[PDB]
Amino acid sequence: QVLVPNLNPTPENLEVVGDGFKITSSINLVGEEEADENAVNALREFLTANNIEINSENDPNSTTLIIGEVDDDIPELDEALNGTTAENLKEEGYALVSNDGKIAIEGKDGDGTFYGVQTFKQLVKESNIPEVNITDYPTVSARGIVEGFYGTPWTHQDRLDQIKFYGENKLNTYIYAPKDDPYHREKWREPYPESEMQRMQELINASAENKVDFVFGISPGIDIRFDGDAGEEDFNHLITKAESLYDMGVRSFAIYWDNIQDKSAAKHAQVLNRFNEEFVKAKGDVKPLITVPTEYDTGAMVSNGQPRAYTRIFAETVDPSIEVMWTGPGVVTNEIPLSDAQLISGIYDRNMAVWWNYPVTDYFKGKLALGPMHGLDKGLNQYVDFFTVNPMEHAELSKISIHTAADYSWNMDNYDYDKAWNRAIDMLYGDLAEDMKVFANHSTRMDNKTWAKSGREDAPELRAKMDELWNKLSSKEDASALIEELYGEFARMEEACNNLKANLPEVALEECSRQLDELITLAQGDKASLDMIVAQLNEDTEAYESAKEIAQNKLNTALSSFAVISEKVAQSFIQEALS
Amino acid sequence: LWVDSTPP
Ligand SMILES: *[C@@H]1O[C@H](CO)[C@@H](O)[C@H](O)[C@H]1NC(C)=O
C-alpha cells in the first residue's frame, strides 16, 4: 500500500481508491500529440529524470498514462477517468485518476493539464503511485510573486530557478518590478541594453514553459510629466517600453505609483486608462493592467471609514477592468481580516489584488522571514481575486514562505499555517528538515518596533515554557523539571544549527549563515541564563557570577552583530535573566 | 528618500 505523499498545494478533492501500484519501467503515453505542449514537456522531463522509458508501440503490460484537455477529442481519456470529469471545473482545474495500472490527467484547459502533471510528479515516490481520484482547481485565480523590494535585485539564475519553482507549486504570476533596477524606476524611460533584453527573453520563455504569467512592471512616478507635449512624450515612453517587452512575448503589464512624491490621483488613473485603451485592449491578447496607487495600505487610504482625497479620486477615475493592489491595513501588518478587504473592495467597486509584504525584509535586513502566510483571512477570496507576495532579496530562503503562499491561494478555506509550514520545510529540506524547522522556527516574526510588524510569533511553545518558568520561580514552586526540559531545547538549537552549518548546500547556507551563528550564540546564552537561575536556587555565588559573565558575553555578541533572530524569545530570555 | 516603504 502506497501512502499519499506530501502535496503542495493541497488538492481540493482527493480520494484514495486502491492500494496503489508501481509504475512499470516504461509506459504507454496517450494523447500527447493534442495535449498541452508544456504539460507534456514537464511530464517528459520527469519521466527521463526517473528512468521511465516511453514505449513506441503499445505494450498492454505497461502502465498507461493518458493526458489531454477537456477540449481535445480524445475518448480513451474519458474512459480512464471513470466518470470523473474536468468539464465542470473552473479555469486551471483538472481531474487526475489512478486505478488499475492507468493514470489519466484531464485539464479544464492547458494550464490545468500542466498543473495535473505537477500533482502527478508529487504523487510518485520511487515509481510507486497511490491509486486516487482527484478534482482540483484554485481558490484565487492569480497567484504568485511581485519582485518589488528595495535592495539587490534577484539575479538571472535566481529568477530562472524561482520560475521553475512557481510552476511546480501552481503559482501562475511573477511581477518583474525590482525597485533598484534603474530601467524599472529611476530611469524608466530608457531602453534595456541588448544583453539585458536577451536575459528578459530567457525569462519570458521560461515563464511560458512553466505556465507563469510574466508581468512587466514599470514605476514612472518619480518624474513622469502628465500634460501637453511633455505628457505625450512621456506617455509614448511607456508605450515603447511595454511594446518592446510585448515584442518578446510578454502579455501582462503593471504600472506602479507607490513611494513617490507626486499625488496627482486623476493624472495617475488617466495614464492607466489611456494605456489600457491604447495598449492593453488594442493588442487583444493582453491580460488586465495591474497597478498600485500612491496610497496603498488602508491606513494611508482611508480616514474614519471614508476614503482620503487621493484614494477617492483614484477609485473614481480608474477603469473597472484594471487590477488595483493594496497591502492590507498597513504596509507590513499582522492581518488582513475579511472586514478590511470588504472596506477596500467597497471603495473600488471591484475585487482587489493583495500585495502581501512578507517575507520581504528590505526594511529590517538582519532578520530572515521564514514563516508561513499568517493573519490572512480564509474567506479573503470573497473580495480578492489576485494574490502576490513580496519576497526577500534572498531567493532561496524566500521559498519556504512562498511555498505556503501556494497553498493559501490555491486551497484557501483548507489552509492551516502550521501544517503548511511543516510541509514547506519537509518538501524543501529533505534529510535536514527537522533541524531546519528548529532554526526557522525562531525566525518567523518581523518587527521593526515602528511601522512594520507581521508574521507568526517566533518559537511560541518555547516562549510559553519561558514564561511558565518565571511564574514557577516568583511563586517559589519546584521548577526543576522545567529547567531540565529547557536545557534540552537550548542544547537542541545549538545541535541543529551546527548541523545546518555543516550540511546545508551553498545556495541556502550563503543566505542564512550569519543567523545560524546568531542563534547558536543565543542558545548558549540561554543555557548560561538557566545556569544563573540554578545557582540562585542553590545560593552558590561563585557559579552565578561566572554564568552571568557568560550570559552577558553572548548577549553582547548578539546585540552588536548584524544578524537578528528570536528577539522576543531566545534573546529576550537572556535580558530577562539579567535583572 | 525611499530605501524601504517608511511612511512620511
Ligand atoms: C513598500 O513596502 C515594502 C517593504 O519595504 C517594499 O518592499 C515595497 O516595495 C513598497 N511598496 C509597496 C506597495 O508595498
Numbering used by the authors:
A (entry chain A): 40 to 618
B (entry chain P): 145 to 152
From the paper:
Reversible protein O-GlcNAcylation is achieved by the action of two enzymes, O-GlcNAc transferase (OGT) and O-GlcNAcase (OGA). Although it is unclear whether CpOGA is a physiological OGA, it shows significant in vitro O-GlcNAcase activity on O-GlcNAc proteins in lysates from human cell lines and possesses a putative substrate-binding groove conserved with hOGA (Rao et al., 2006; Schimpl et al., 2010). We report the molecular details of the interaction of a bacterial O-GlcNAcase homolog with three different synthetic glycopeptides derived from characterized O-GlcNAc sites in the human proteome. In addition to extensive contacts with the sugar, O-GlcNAcase recognizes the peptide backbone through hydrophobic interactions and intramolecular hydrogen bonds, while avoiding interactions with the glycopeptide side chains.
